[PDB]
Design an enzyme around this catalytic site. Structure first.
Site, mmCIF file in Angstrom:
data_model
loop_
_atom_site.group_PDB
_atom_site.id
_atom_site.type_symbol
_atom_site.label_atom_id
_atom_site.label_comp_id
_atom_site.label_asym_id
_atom_site.label_seq_id
_atom_site.Cartn_x
_atom_site.Cartn_y
_atom_site.Cartn_z
ATOM 1 N N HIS A 638 0.847 -1.175 0.000
ATOM 2 C CA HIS A 638 0.000 0.000 0.000
ATOM 3 C C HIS A 638 0.893 1.239 0.000
ATOM 4 C CE1 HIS A 638 -3.278 2.744 1.330
ATOM 5 N NE2 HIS A 638 -2.261 3.357 1.908
ATOM 6 N N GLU A 639 1.905 1.234 0.865
ATOM 7 C CA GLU A 639 2.817 2.360 0.974
ATOM 8 C C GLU A 639 3.601 2.563 -0.298
ATOM 9 O OE1 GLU A 639 1.176 2.590 4.597
ATOM 10 O OE2 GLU A 639 2.205 4.049 3.309
ATOM 11 N N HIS A 642 1.878 4.948 -2.675
ATOM 12 C CA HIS A 642 2.238 6.348 -2.500
ATOM 13 C C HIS A 642 3.578 6.610 -3.163
ATOM 14 C CE1 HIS A 642 -1.080 6.829 0.227
ATOM 15 N NE2 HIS A 642 -0.614 5.890 1.027
ATOM 16 N N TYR A 680 -11.194 2.757 3.729
ATOM 17 C CA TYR A 680 -9.927 3.417 3.937
ATOM 18 C C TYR A 680 -9.518 4.080 2.628
ATOM 19 C CZ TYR A 680 -4.943 4.055 4.843
ATOM 20 O OH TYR A 680 -3.682 4.574 4.958
ATOM 21 N N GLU A 687 -4.901 8.002 -0.999
ATOM 22 C CA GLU A 687 -5.252 6.792 -0.283
ATOM 23 C C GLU A 687 -6.009 5.852 -1.213
ATOM 24 O OE1 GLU A 687 -4.190 6.297 2.955
ATOM 25 O OE2 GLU A 687 -3.034 8.073 2.389
HETATM 26 O O1 LIG Z 1 -4.273 6.763 9.274
HETATM 27 C C1 LIG Z 1 -4.048 5.825 8.528
HETATM 28 O O2 LIG Z 1 -4.437 4.692 8.825
HETATM 29 C C2 LIG Z 1 -3.313 6.045 7.199
HETATM 30 C C3 LIG Z 1 -1.814 6.273 7.397
HETATM 31 N N1 LIG Z 1 -1.160 6.293 6.086
HETATM 32 C C4 LIG Z 1 -0.840 7.442 5.504
HETATM 33 O O3 LIG Z 1 -1.027 8.502 6.108
HETATM 34 C C5 LIG Z 1 -0.076 7.347 4.341
HETATM 35 C C6 LIG Z 1 0.738 8.338 3.807
HETATM 36 C C7 LIG Z 1 0.582 9.710 4.005
HETATM 37 C C8 LIG Z 1 -0.509 10.245 4.544
HETATM 38 C C9 LIG Z 1 -0.426 11.566 4.420
HETATM 39 C C10 LIG Z 1 0.739 11.851 3.840
HETATM 40 C C11 LIG Z 1 1.350 13.090 3.724
HETATM 41 C C12 LIG Z 1 2.677 13.129 3.318
HETATM 42 C C13 LIG Z 1 3.338 14.357 3.236
HETATM 43 C C14 LIG Z 1 2.674 15.531 3.550
HETATM 44 CL CL1 LIG Z 1 3.461 17.052 3.327
HETATM 45 C C15 LIG Z 1 1.332 15.490 3.956
HETATM 46 C C16 LIG Z 1 0.675 14.275 4.043
HETATM 47 O O4 LIG Z 1 1.408 10.694 3.541
HETATM 48 S S1 LIG Z 1 0.182 5.668 4.090
HETATM 49 C C17 LIG Z 1 -0.723 5.186 5.468
HETATM 50 S S2 LIG Z 1 -1.122 3.556 5.972
HETATM 51 ZN ZN LIG Z 2 -1.962 5.460 2.585
#
Ligand SMILES: O=C(O)CCN1C(=O)/C(=C\c2ccc(-c3ccc(Cl)cc3)o2)SC1=S
Ligand SMILES: [Zn+2]
EC number: 3.4.24.83
Length: 728
Positions: A638-639, A642, A680, A687
């Site tokens: 999943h990651e 991104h 999700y 996401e």
């Molecule tokens: O809360 C959760 O369960 C989701 C957490 N999650 C994420 O939160 C993911 C990546 C992510 C989220 C937000 C961002 C983000 C990354 C960089 C900046 Cl500047 C702002 C937001 O990357 S991958 C993953 S699992």
């Molecule tokens: Zn994510």
């Protein structure tokens, strides 16, 4: 091998339990039984003594002896090792069962020559062991059951023929725990039988010949594991439990009598965390804040848990806007309990981690350095040798994901064997970054604690003594796992974990070499320069080795479900920016790949996985259960979504750093299909993209199909991005 003492101890042990009573040849007879019983593991003789048993070497019809007259006459007809009926007034051995056990052996000297008799004697002793000794500590159990099934369900039926009665021979399915429960006598018999063959040197070969598994089992059991059996057995004895506590108590007597008020205060707040008091929470918010509190519908947030949600709710009752979410992010930090041990665990001991306000960071450091100085005296003493300490643990603490199915869904008293094997798989070493609070003598666990550790301390291990019979250990302990097995205690099944304390450096070197290995391996698979530091293990907690060994498995899954050239292009991109594939067991807010790129502390994120663009790193937390993400693999992939959303969008406005998930093209695709996949995934663009990407590369081909027929435009989109990146 200061074993001469083992002979002298075997000598002193005989002294008490062995009572010779013959004609007058007391010398040829007395030393004859010495040779007969020498073949037996010393520790079983001491266990027999523990339960008040005694051994009598007599002449003539044994049923004549005092101790066996009170014998209901029917018990006067036994069965030999081979199952042929006999008559006590004709036989040479008998082990009276009961709360005053007795072993009667008709004197002789040809035990040397007549292997059949010695064999029979050992069988009766084996019977004492499995029926009089082990039953008092709920054994044999699952481990031994496995040996039995290995035998019944084996190629060659000879093993069965040699040790099984037709009752077990004919039993249809394998022997369940329930079977061992209503056929106790039966299992105990096989045990004794195998114990017997193992002990009588002439039959040992036959045992190893037709029943290898039984041989290996009794081999390991009589060489090492029996000592622990004795240990557990002493643990049920009152005076034994109290004697152990007293020696430890006095070894630390001086340390105690010298502890200051501040001293005691520290140990106590380390046992009971201080919860935040409303009164202060309120008096730390300017009215602007205060009203946005009474205004904001707490129950609307996401990052807040039940207790956190609840607690906050009473803050209003006591007195989603992007800005107000920022207000809660702050409160989340301030409403956390002051929990020293939790802080060490969260940070893996990296207490300078900027994951909490500087004022509390400093208070944690001050209290921790102070506790570290208090626990200066090591356990090593002249009052005792090897020392075992106990700890009841909640499995979620090690792996919430497996902890989810540990207990049997229907019968909560049982442990699910499937999850048990998976949990035991790569559990070899463990680390303690906080202060372990262990019990001097084993004690009953809480409902959620189905893990019972039996830890062998190093004489070097430093600790503090607590009046209630516990010890607080120094932080940064190393632990090797020696044995993981299912046991039953008080009508309930638990996972016994036998561990030995070793220097934390020994374990770190293992992790550190592992990191070297895994990078050498994957740098080659991906075509990266020989020495690139791509993969990193940030391991500091109790399920340490699992984090390490799961990484290999995760990356293998990662490579077998994604286009090799997609991986390469993307990971080269990540590497170019000093990215990292971080596998840790400390909460994400303490991995710098994330924290050194934050503006505010509260802007931190903790979860199963997380991708950080600034550091181009993928962070994967081991212990937690990803928001209903089947396993670690799904989460890592999943990651990686991104990661792709990043490299694609980068190959977009080439001269910038924007996500391809920001494109109007995709935003609209999400506007329409953004609800067809997962909840999700419904969260937002990136996401949705990551979830979609993930399902598309799932091992479950049915998964892939769901996207194909529920997110058709998205499916075709992700694919466009793939070929894009591959050809670019
Ligand atoms: O809360 C959760 O369960 C989701 C957490 N999650 C994420 O939160 C993911 C990546 C992510 C989220 C937000 C961002 C983000 C990354 C960089 C900046 Cl500047 C702002 C937001 O990357 S991958 C993953 S699992
Ligand atoms: Zn994510």
């Amino acid at each position: 091998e200061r074993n001469k003492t083992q002979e002298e101890h075997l000598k002193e042990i005989m002294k008490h339990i062995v009572k010779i009573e013959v004609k007058g040849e007391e010398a040829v007879k007395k030393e004859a039984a010495e040779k007969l019983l020498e073949k037996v593991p010393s520790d079983v003789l001491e266990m027999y003594k523990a339960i008040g048993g005694k051994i009598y070497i007599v002449d003539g019809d044994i049923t004549k002896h005092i101790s066996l007259e009170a014998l209901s006459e029917d018990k006067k007809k036994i069965k030999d090792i081979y199952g042929k009926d006999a008559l006590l007034h004709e036989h040479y051995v008998y082990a009276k069962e009961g709360y005053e056990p007795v072993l009667v052996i008709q004197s002789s000297e040809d035990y040397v020559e007549n292997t059949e008799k010695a064999l029979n004697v050992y069988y009766e002793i084996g019977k004492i062991l499995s029926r009089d000794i082990l039953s008092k500590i709920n054994q044999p159990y699952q481990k031994f059951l496995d040996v039995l099934n290995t035998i019944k369900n084996a190629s060659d039926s000879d093993g069965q023929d040699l040790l099984f009665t037709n009752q077990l021979k004919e039993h249809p399915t394998d022997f369940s725990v329930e079977f061992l429960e209503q056929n106790s006598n039966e299992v105990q018999e096989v045990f004794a039988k195998a114990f017997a063959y193992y002990i009588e040197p002439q039959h040992r070969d036959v045992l190893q010949l037709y029943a290898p598994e039984a041989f290996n089992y009794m081999d390991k059991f009589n060489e090492q594991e029996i000592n622990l059996s004795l240990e557990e057995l002493k643990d049920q004895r009152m005076l034994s439990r109290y004697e152990k506590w007293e020696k430890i108590k006095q070894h630390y007597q001086h340390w105690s009598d010298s502890l200051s008020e501040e001293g005691r205060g520290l140990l106590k707040k380390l046992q009971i965390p201080i919860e935040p008091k409303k009164d202060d929470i309120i008096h730390s918010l300017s009215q602007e804040e205060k009203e946005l509190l009474k205004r904001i519908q707490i129950d609307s947030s996401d990052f807040l848990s039940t207790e956190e949600k609840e607690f906050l709710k009473k803050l209003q009752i006591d007195i989603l806007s992007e800005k107000e979410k920022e207000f809660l992010k702050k409160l989340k930090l301030d409403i956390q309990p002051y929990d020293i041990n939790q802080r060490l665990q969260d940070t893996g001991g990296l207490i300078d981690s900027p994951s909490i306000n500087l004022d509390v960071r400093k208070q944690y450091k001050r209290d921790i350095q102070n506790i570290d100085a208090l626990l200066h005296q090591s356990i090593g003493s002249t009052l005792y040798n090897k020392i075992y300490l106990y700890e009841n643990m909640n499995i979620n603490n090690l792996t919430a994901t497996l902890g989810a199915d540990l207990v049997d869904s229907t019968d909560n008293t049982k442990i699910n064997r499937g999850i048990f094997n998976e949990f035991k798989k790569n559990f070899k070493y463990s680390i303690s970054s906080n202060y372990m609070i262990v019990d001097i003598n084993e004690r009953p666990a809480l409902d959620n604690e189905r893990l019972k550790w039996r830890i062998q301390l190093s004489p070097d291990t430093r600790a503090g003594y607590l009046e209630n019979g516990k010890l607080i250990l120094q932080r940064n302990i190393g632990l090797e796992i020696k044995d993981v097995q299912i046991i039953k205690q008080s009508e309930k099944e638990y996972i016994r974990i036998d561990a030995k304390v070793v220097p934390k450096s020994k374990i770190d070197t293992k992790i550190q070499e592992a990191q070297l290995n895994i990078n050498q391996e994957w740098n080659k698979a991906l075509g990266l320069p020989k020495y690139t530091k791509l993969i990193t293990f940030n391991v500091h907690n109790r399920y340490a080795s699992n984090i390490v060994e799961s990484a290999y498995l995760i990356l293998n899954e990662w490579k077998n479900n994604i286009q090799s050239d997609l991986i390469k292009k993307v990971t080269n991109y990540l590497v170019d920016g000093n990215g990292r594939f971080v596998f840790t067991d400390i909460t994400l807010p303490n991995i710098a790949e994330q924290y050194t790129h934050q503006d505010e502390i509260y802007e931190q994120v903790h979860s199963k996985g997380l991708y950080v663009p600034e550091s181009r790193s993928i962070l994967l937390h081991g212990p937690s259960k990803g928001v209903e993400l089947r396993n670690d693999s799904e989460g890592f992939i999943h990651e990686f979504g991104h990661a792709v959303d990043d490299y694609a969008g980068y190959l977009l406005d080439k001269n910038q750093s924007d996500l391809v998930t920001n494109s109007k093209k995709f935003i609209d695709i999400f506007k329409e299909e953004g609800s067809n996949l997962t909840s999700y995934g419904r969260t937002n663009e990136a996401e949705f993209f990551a979830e979609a990407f993930r399902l598309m590369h799932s091992t479950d081909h049915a998964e892939r199909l769901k996207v194909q027929k529920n997110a058709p435009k998205t499916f075709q989109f992700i694919n466009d991005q793939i070929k894009f990146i591959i050809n670019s």
